[PDB]
């Protein structure tokens, strides 16, 4: 469908929702929570505004075996649009840790509901490192020069974060740190030059 998925800007509210809901649906130890991500598209820049949990039960043994109540998604959705009818279904959050090629099948289900290609926004909840805990991937089907008779695949997409005015002021009210991503005075930036070298080295 929509090829338009050039950039992904991500609401901090989405993150926050994905982290919290993980525990109040009470899933732990690599038991996946799948929920819907709502926001705008048919736009170059994709903006993920908000999210909601769906119930998700996943069989321990295999990732080809799983329960998802389809009907729930439609019932939730219609009330949610009353609140704000701008928002549309655009894809799904996956609660990490990390990509699977079983997702390709999962994605396809969501595609029925959606009029755009579903975005798979892997919000990692384990927060490894201080670097962004989002990789974004979209299911695309493309041809490849090797010989392969059409490959179906997940291509990495750039993840950044943007917050609304309402959202941004919430971030700053919460924080009470001295901060050091400020890159302000001679001291913060002194650190920042060293920090970047070693940043590079590891990579």
């Amino acid at each position: 469908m929509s090829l338009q998925h050039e950039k992904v800007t991500i609401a901090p509210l989405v993150l926050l929702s994905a982290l919290d809901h993980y525990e109040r649906t009470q899933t732990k130890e690599n038991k996946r929570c799948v929920g819907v991500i709502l926001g705008d598209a048919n736009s170059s820049t994709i903006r993920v505004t908000n999210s909601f949990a769906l119930p998700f039960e996943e069989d321990e043994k295999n990732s080809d075996v799983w329960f998802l109540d389809h009907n729930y998604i439609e019932n939730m959705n219609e009330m949610c649009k009353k609140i704000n009818a701008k928002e549309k279904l655009i894809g799904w959050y996956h609660s990490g840790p990390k990509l699977r090629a079983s997702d390709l099948k999962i994605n396809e289900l969501f595609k029925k509901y959606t009029q755009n290609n579903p975005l798979l926004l892997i919000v990692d909840v384990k927060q490894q490192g201080v670097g962004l805990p989002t990789d974004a991937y979209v299911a695309i089907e493309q041809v490849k020069d090797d010989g392969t008779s059409t490959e179906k695949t997940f291509l990495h997409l750039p993840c950044t974060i943007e917050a609304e005015e309402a959202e941004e002021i919430g971030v700053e009210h919460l924080l009470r740190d001295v901060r050091d991503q400020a890159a302000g005075g001679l001291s913060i930036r002194l650190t920042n030059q060293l920090k970047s070298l070693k940043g590079l080295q590891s990579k």
Partner: protein, 197 residues
């Protein structure tokens, strides 16, 4: 069986195409889902039924538990006619769906249509057979696919599942020539199924 939540498995395989049963076997099963739905409901009005597919590479949820025949029927319109049955994944997903119930009292039953010989190995189906009786879930097999060219593998699996117990499994083998698919299931136990305890 009063108080029952039923997963139906509809197979939409390259063997349902075949005109074996009037009009086509594929079109026969549509009638068959509606007839089953009304039989179950009249038995005990608090029963419910859902529909999953076994067809395609990955079983696809059409409809979860509903008391409504049109919903199930709406779901029957989405179908892939080039899928291929894969029993092993279908049984496992089917149980899961059954563990969520409007009331905990309702039994767990699968009635599955089987139209093609089971491509999965004999060893897998031996493990599956004892997985099912462990969690008190019985499986009732509508067979008319496997008889065509293969020995009744499905019989050994049913025998292990059946013990003295309220949950009873059965193997129902359907006259393959014309006699109307829904009629055979009608003249067989379908709510006249007894226990074994």
């Amino acid at each position: 069986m009063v108080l029952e939540a039923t997963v139906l498995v509809i197979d939409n395989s390259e063997y349902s195409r075949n005109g074996d049963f009037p009009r086509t076997r594929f079109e026969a099963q549509i009638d068959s889902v509606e007839f089953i739905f009304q039989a179950k409901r009249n038995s005990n009005p608090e029963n419910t039924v859902g529909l999953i597919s076994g067809a395609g590479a990955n079983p696809r949820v059409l409809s979860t538990f509903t008391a409504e025949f049109g919903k199930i029927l709406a779901g029957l319109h989405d179908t892939q006619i080039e899928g291929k049955l894969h029993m092993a994944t279908a049984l496992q997903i089917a149980q899961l769906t059954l563990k969520h119930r409007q009331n905990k009292v309702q039994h767990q039953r699968i009635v599955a249509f089987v139209c093609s010989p089971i491509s999965d190995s004999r060893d897998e189906l031996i493990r599956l057979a004892k997985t099912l009786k462990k969690n008190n879930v019985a499986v009732d097999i509508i067979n008319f696919g496997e008889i065509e060219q293969n020995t009744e593998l499905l019989d050994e699996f049913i025998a292990a599942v059946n013990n003295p117990q309220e949950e009873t499994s059965h193997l129902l083998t359907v006259t393959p020539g014309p006699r109307l698919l829904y009629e055979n299931i009608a003249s067989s136990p379908i709510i006249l199924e007894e226990g074994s305890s």
